[PDB]
Amino acid sequence: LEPPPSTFQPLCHPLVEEVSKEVDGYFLQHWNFPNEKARKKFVAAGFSRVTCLYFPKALDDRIHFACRLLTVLFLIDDLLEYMSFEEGSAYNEKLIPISRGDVLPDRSIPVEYIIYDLWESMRAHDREMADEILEPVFLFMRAQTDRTRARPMGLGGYLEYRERDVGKELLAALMRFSMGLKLSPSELQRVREIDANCSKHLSVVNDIYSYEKELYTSKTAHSEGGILCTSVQILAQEADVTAEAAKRVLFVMCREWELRHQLLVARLSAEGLETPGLAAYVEGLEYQMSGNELWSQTTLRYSV
Amino acid sequence: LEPPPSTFQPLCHPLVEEVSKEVDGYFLQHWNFPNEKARKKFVAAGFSRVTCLYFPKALDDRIHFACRLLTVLFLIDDLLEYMSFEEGSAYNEKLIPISRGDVLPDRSIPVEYIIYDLWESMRAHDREMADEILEPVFLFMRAQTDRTRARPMGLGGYLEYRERDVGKELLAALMRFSMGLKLSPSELQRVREIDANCSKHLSVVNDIYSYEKELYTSKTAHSEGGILCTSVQILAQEADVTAEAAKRVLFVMCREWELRHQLLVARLSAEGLETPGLAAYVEGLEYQMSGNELWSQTTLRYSV
Ligand SMILES: C=C(C)[C@H]1CC[N@@H+]2CCC[C@H](C)[C@@]2(C)C1
Ligand SMILES: C=C(C)[C@H]1CC[N@@H+]2CCC[C@H](C)[C@@]2(C)C1
Ligand SMILES: [Mg+2]
Ligand SMILES: [Mg+2]
Ligand SMILES: [Mg+2]
Ligand SMILES: [Mg+2]
Ligand SMILES: [Mg+2]
Numbered sequence A, B: 001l002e003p004p005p006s007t008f009q010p011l012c013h014p015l016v017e018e019v020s021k022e023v024d025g026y027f028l029q030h031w032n033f034p035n036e037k038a039r040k041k042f043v044a045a046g047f048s049r050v051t052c053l054y055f056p057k058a059l060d061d062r063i064h065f066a067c068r069l070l071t072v073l074f075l076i077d078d079l080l081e082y083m084s085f086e087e088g089s090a091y092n093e094k095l096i097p098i099s100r101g102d103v104l105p106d107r108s109i110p111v112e113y114i115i116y117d118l119w120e121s122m123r124a125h126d127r128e129m130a131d132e133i134l135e136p137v138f139l140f141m142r143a144q145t146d147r148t149r150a151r152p153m154g155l156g157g158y159l160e161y162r163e164r165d166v167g168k169e170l171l172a173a174l175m176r177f178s179m180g181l182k183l184s185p186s187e188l189q190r191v192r193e194i195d196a197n198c199s200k201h202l203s204v205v206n207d208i209y210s211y212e213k214e215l216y217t218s219k220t221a222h223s224e225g226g227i228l229c230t231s232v233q234i235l236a237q238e239a240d241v242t243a244e245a246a247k248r249v250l251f252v253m254c255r256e257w258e259l260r261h262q263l264l265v266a267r268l269s270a271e272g273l274e275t276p277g278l279a280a281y282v283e284g285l286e287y288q289m290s291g292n293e294l295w296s297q298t299t300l301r302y303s304v
């Protein structure tokens, strides 16, 4: 699969090697893997590597929090595939009060205490910015088991839903936390078109590379949790082409979204609305798009 | 607009010039054009040229019938843009029994006697093959004013509907007629998937090139008859990109349909199911696709 040209230059956080060792090591100590094969597969994924590609301008003393959060979320994303919507929702809802810190974790259950300790540590570091990630995470978690996944969707409807399931908002708040980048409500409201555009790119680039993994899952895992929900399948169906053909077409659309990002950024600046905070922010989103692509292309999570 | 690479090479009927003069000449004599500007615009379109590009292997003494039929359908297609759906339906429905020869035309009304005389001349030449064009034409006519045009559609629903509005079936029956190419019902059932795929290519290539014309029409003619119904707008809205962006993506999808045509034909031959008749037929479909594209990218109908 030959990606169409992009003008985006992906960047990776400079501390990626040390932070990946730290965070992978933490999960290898605490998380419950079913066997050694699974432990190796976990390390192969490079969950801290994608985090460092997503947030290359994260502050050095903050990048690890982001790595931990995305790692645990990846792990849960995989667990949900073996559950019904009802079971998955129950699993996720239990972690919400724990994430807030309202409820103590069962220390015999790694997901509970990992989640609890992580969020406590983030609030200890920067309470205001950590709290601003909570609702975006819960919105993502609830989308994961939304019944809409069991209903046919068109492309537009899918992308509207997928903005939640792909965790666009959580990634934005996490990026801001990791960079210590504070924005006003007016600044935030100002870039909503830019956000919505960026989420389609993240979503579809992921869909393109994760399709084979997810097709297999739809055949082998739970009839609800493993359900095939992806732009690749949707376009293949609507246009009556193969999944591989749909990937090639979707990749061209991703590049059109890249062009639109540049246009929207130019226009924000042109109408005198680009603050220094907003400039750092929209550049931040570009790294998310190019980083997501670079990792997705190379990660063993999708290639094997 | 740079079309991506294609391996389909167009071909034009050898008698294109003389048949064009003949058929243009007939319509200039009989059709009620409003003024000299419209007469010139009619000749500028090259309706017999597109017909000769669609059916380059038509029999020398049948190609003119196809030019006449497509020419009158083009003229009516344009008239409908200034009517409500209801008016358009009444207009087309009048012509249906006349096309059958069941009702005599009012000889003071050019569209009626042109339609009557044409179909009578086709039945005189080859009755069985002429009759096989009737219902496909009527299916297309009824799609033209179907209120589904004014209701939301996704890409898949559009392509399904547009198969009728683009006249895929009538073009196929007309192609066979013009070539004297008789296929059995079983043979036709074998290539149904091939037909469906070819329809999407004809549709979207036309949509891409005729978009500027249709956009202008939507803003200036009847709000129903001139309504913008096209994959360019549908994809632009589904993806939230410009019309120009949608065209680029759609063009790549057209090449995917070309690949699929080649795969389906190869499979048909491999299974020992490609009769000599079917071989001629599928090659004929390829000419429609490439001829449609060559004319669309060059006709003054779309560029001015
Ligand atoms: C940061 C990414 C590479 C996204 C890819 C898909 N995963 C699924 C698990 C939960 C994450 C938020 C994410 C959507 C992240
Ligand atoms: C044969 C073609 C080039 C198609 C182009 C669009 N026109 C519009 C008028 C009615 C025709 C059937 C057609 C769809 C033919
Ligand atoms: Mg997943
Ligand atoms: Mg998921
Ligand atoms: Mg995926
Ligand atoms: Mg038209
Ligand atoms: Mg039309």
Ligand SMILES: [Mg+2]
Residues within 6 Å of the ligand: B206, B207, B210, B211, B214
């Ligand atoms: Mg058109």
